[PDB]
Amino acid sequence: PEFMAQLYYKKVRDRIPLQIVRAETELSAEEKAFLNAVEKGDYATVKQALQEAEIYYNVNINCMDPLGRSALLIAIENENLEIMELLLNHSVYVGDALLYAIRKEVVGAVELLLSYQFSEFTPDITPIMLAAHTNNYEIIKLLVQKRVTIPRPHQIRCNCVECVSSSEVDSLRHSRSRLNIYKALASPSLIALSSEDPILTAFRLGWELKELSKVENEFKAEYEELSQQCKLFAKDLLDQARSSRELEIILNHRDDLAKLKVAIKYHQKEFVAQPNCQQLLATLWYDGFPGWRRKHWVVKLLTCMTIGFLFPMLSIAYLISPRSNLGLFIKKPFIKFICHTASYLTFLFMLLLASQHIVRTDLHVQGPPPTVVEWMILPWVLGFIWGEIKEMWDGGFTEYIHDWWNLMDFAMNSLYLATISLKIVAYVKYNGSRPREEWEMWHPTLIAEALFAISNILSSLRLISLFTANSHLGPLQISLGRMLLDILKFLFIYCLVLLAFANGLNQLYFYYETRAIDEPNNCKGIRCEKQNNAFSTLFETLQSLFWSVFGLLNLYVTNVKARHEFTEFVGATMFGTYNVISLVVLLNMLIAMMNNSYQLIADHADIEWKFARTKLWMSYFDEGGTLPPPFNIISLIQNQHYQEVIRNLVKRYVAAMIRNSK
Amino acid sequence: PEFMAQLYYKKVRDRIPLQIVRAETELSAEEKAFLNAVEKGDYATVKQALQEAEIYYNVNINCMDPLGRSALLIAIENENLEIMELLLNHSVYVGDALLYAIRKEVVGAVELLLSYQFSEFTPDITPIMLAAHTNNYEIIKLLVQKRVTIPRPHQIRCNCVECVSSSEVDSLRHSRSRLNIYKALASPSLIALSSEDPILTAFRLGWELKELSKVENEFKAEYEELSQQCKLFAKDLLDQARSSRELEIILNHRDDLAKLKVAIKYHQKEFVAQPNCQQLLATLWYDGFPGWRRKHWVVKLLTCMTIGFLFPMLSIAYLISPRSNLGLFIKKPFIKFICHTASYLTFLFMLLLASQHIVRTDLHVQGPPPTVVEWMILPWVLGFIWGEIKEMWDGGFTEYIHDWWNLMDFAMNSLYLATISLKIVAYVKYNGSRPREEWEMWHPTLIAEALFAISNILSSLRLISLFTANSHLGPLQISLGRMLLDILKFLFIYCLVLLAFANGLNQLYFYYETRAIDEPNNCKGIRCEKQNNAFSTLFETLQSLFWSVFGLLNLYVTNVKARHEFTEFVGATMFGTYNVISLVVLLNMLIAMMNNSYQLIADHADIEWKFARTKLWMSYFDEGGTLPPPFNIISLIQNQHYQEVIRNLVKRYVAAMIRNSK
């Protein structure tokens, strides 16, 4: 019989003889009696046993069970306060007994041990850290009353001698100690009890823990859980506000919604999207419309279009006399938003009018003067450039870059400046009226028109950022922008496959490159009626494979004039393999990946959209940037009140979490 | 070492010194003894302590624990009735102790406190409101027996001085109080106990709470949960009916299925789809077919086709003598449905015959007389118009608009009237027989034919509303109609992207617009053999991008006669970016969004379909609208019985929920 040998033992028949491999020194019969007495609760028996153990040495006071728990730990686990006290009086080893009492979360034993080998706890654990890991307000309060400390963690990217030495001598212990310290600090009970500003402490700690999660590639999930715990603590403190006065004291605290800007800076999405914060925000947003929420959608539409049609009137009123019954009407955030959206929509309307023929120049004049539509477009372009440079001046490139729409605006304005410069060059370097079919490939007028059309696409696509303000379009934009990332990752794999097959196809077909004269209509490439030279060059092959993704590459492009049937079959099979790999493997990768990411989105989409809409709204609360283009180019008592409100909220939160335990 | 400073404290080294930041005034040692005695249960100790506290002032009767719970609250939490009574006799502060007793849900303590700082409850909470939030029948009954009140909530869109003042002084408190009142009113135990009509109260309250959820944009989920709680209460009351007499007493109550029409009006889908309600409905529906359920599908098919083939016979019998053995056969809802479906199918068959050549006119006569097929079509068209105007007359535009199929019928009838009017105009304004290739672009005959073909599409698509009557097609229609909404939202984003890229492409290519004479077959646009001028105008560009979505736009359209290689590459790259953005980004948005919405559908699809089928069935229970086109154009004891049935159902429901607690 063929047996499975060397399963449990190295020795080289039909049975597995089981013995205790790691045998450990057992206790005496009287020691076992001592531990049985301390487990059972026989106070007199334990008293007699250790009283006689005091006389001689035959009995051990610090006798340790095979499971590692001495008599004191069994007394702790059974909450035998009297046996605990009797053991402590007679000098039982009291190492790490406080930690077991704290983890059991019994206040009496913790008080008793606070008033006077193998461990279940890593050596770095202290009583305050372990109590904070249990989030027990009573025990944490007991330990903080007898003034304790928690070691201060270093910066994430620290290079001091301590850090470089601990992480090189013992990396596992150093990482564990760091995580334990952060678990203690991120404790809602410890923040509530011992933080001067619990809400700011939760903000900063959640931020730093998210950053650690990024940096500490392993142990990422624990740091993410700690960050979420801090965020939920801050949001649950905000949940405890009972009046609008408390909420405005919290949100306006600075150390006009200062604490809310701090929350937006730290990406405290849950805190910001808290319903009372959002209700206060919507009250500030609809300043001129107290009854906006209770209006009918037709009334809303007529009011919005009325304010939009009058944005030049409101802007001119603000310019002429800002402090007037009409000057400061555009100072309202919602009116300001309507006026800015109207200004931008008129800009896009003029962009549309540019390509029409309402007023038009001859298409055969090289370097023409600007059209009156282009003349009217220019003030908006200058206003957008001025607004973006003002934004970067007021925010720094570190905040300018953080916005993707801001980079898109940068590209838009760069293309518009290039269009103006190319139009100037064409105007001052060409005088005649050469027919357009005679113009060179890189004529500045042709390049100016191309750049202007790209600018038009970008400007019109800039409207998707206004979706955030809508209850229905906002979450859609959040989901779309969040799956753009897996689109990018799939784009990486797709471009690698594309480049591989372009290499192969071009290596095959680059011999049969025909000259453009030899083609039917003197047309070379795949943008002809008769597609030809699809894989003759690398750039063309890349275009051909891209367009094959959409079925716009015909099959006859895989055929050569020489009619080399083996080469034409190998090219057709490379093309077919590319079509299989891309169209029905990687595209379905994209579909499945999008479905997964979209489920993960739809879980949190409401909070994400509310945070984005709060950012959008806050962008209109400030005085700077009131006028839309083209018109933009022409203390101690506060801390006392915050501390009282925080006192009340911490009390309410502590009571709430204590009840939620029960 | 770089430390993370200012984590817990503002002060600007390697340790975090933890102190109690919000220190609160502790109690005396004797006060702590008093609270320890009241927690422990030492009746004699507490009695002695407060008896001696009566003499001097050294002890405080109203001593309050750091956790905010005084001695009375600890007695309540431990259900110490005797200590509670002794404390109440000696004048302990009794503020908000009833609320803690109610939340603990102990009847003895509530009775004791009903017979004689920091709070865990918001100040607006009253005993009856809190008891209703706990849904405890015993406690609610105790509090209602001692006559109490709940403040009456205002209308959703209220503008009185009270509302405008409370919401401006304290919006958070006002919103909280409104939600608390609605949480109390939506309590199944309070509705069962104190509502004259529990089922109608649940209907109205669920409706109003859904409307509040709509209006109160924040706190939407709480109002939605309250609405669902009301709906489930009504459905669970209906679940308690044990005989068909009780069910017919409930459903026919009016204050012929009056309560069921009220349930349909309030969108009480769960109540309507309750199996016994549906069984009664199916009994009323198959009036002429008692054994319909137990028949074989072939027998059903033969019977249905027999009744359908005889719809003119049944309609004429109803016309000649409505009160006869054959006149009132079409008065049965299922027979009526079969006859209406047959009438409409014959109408669609004649619409199909219209485009055939069984009988046909010369295609070169402008303004021809109607074909005999069109002559036969006319009575159905008149009947449909008459039926829709009768429906709007009997239902008001407010109910007419609520149906989407009703708007589709409006469009159908408008197009049919336009077709008749255009045919009349062509007949009375053209006499000759001009060849059809000579006709003008806007010839009334051509427009009449176009409108008639659109009407044919709409009429044939109107059959999808009959899917509701089928067990398999009905849920499919429900799912399809529910994902049409995310289709619409994606249509918004898609049209924005479409317009952006159409702007760019037209701005690029509008210079190279060739004249239609210069094209191969004198054909301009993308509906030619040689597609050309794809992006020459804005409307054409919009069509070209739309058709590129389906691959019907060829690539050579991105090429100009002038052979401007940079412009042709920029156009091809705009076209490629549009194809990437739309075809493999937004379409996959649609796929993932549809999958999510379809999961949410499939959860409730059965209830949704049963509600829709009940509406369809109820549309055939009424005498008005018996004849299908073209033939349609030629009390106190009841309340007593309802109250007895409601008494029995409320008793059964109360017992059921009490047991479900255990």
Ligand SMILES: CC(C)CCC[C@@H](C)[C@H]1CC[C@H]2[C@@H]3CC=C4C[C@@H](OC(=O)CCC(=O)O)CC[C@]4(C)[C@H]3CC[C@]12C
């Ligand atoms: C999509 C095609 C047909 C091009 C149409 C372009 C514009 C006419 C549309 C596209 C996106 C729309 C915007 C989408 C988002 C909104 C939200 C809308 O209502 C709100 O919810 C904001 C007010 C609030 O926060 O209460 C105000 C208008 C606005 C900017 C819309 C204005 C009209 C816009 C610019």
Ligand SMILES: CC(C)CCC[C@@H](C)[C@H]1CC[C@H]2[C@@H]3CC=C4C[C@@H](OC(=O)CCC(=O)O)CC[C@]4(C)[C@H]3CC[C@]12C
């Ligand atoms: C799909 C193509 C081939 C065109 C065929 C058109 C009609 C012949 C079909 C399409 C939808 C069918 C309807 C789909 C729904 C039903 C349910 C069917 O059986 C039922 O469940 C209703 C009776 C009941 O409630 O018990 C009765 C016929 C009817 C109207 C069908 C009649 C035949 C219809 C009109």
Ligand SMILES: CC(C)[C@@]12C[C@@H](OC(=O)CO)[C@@](C)(O1)[C@@H]1CC[C@@H](C)[C@H]1[C@@H]2OC(=O)/C=C/c1ccccc1
């Ligand atoms: C959109 C634009 C950036 C494109 C579109 C081409 O334009 C043309 O070929 C006409 O000249 C061009 C020049 O630039 C490149 C040639 C090779 C490939 C990288 C193409 C680029 O395409 C993608 O980067 C991504 C494509 C994709 C995404 C998802 C699913 C399937 C495909």
Ligand SMILES: CC(C)[C@@]12C[C@@H](OC(=O)CO)[C@@](C)(O1)[C@@H]1CC[C@@H](C)[C@H]1[C@@H]2OC(=O)/C=C/c1ccccc1
């Ligand atoms: C269907 C009909 C309403 C269309 C179809 C066009 O007809 C033609 O172009 C021939 O003349 C036309 C005239 O009217 C419009 C031109 C531009 C675009 C809005 C088209 C419309 O199309 C959609 O509204 C939506 C399209 C879509 C939806 C989902 C996924 C992908 C695309």
Ligand SMILES: [Zn+2]
């Ligand atoms: Zn064997």
Ligand SMILES: [Zn+2]
């Ligand atoms: Zn360091």
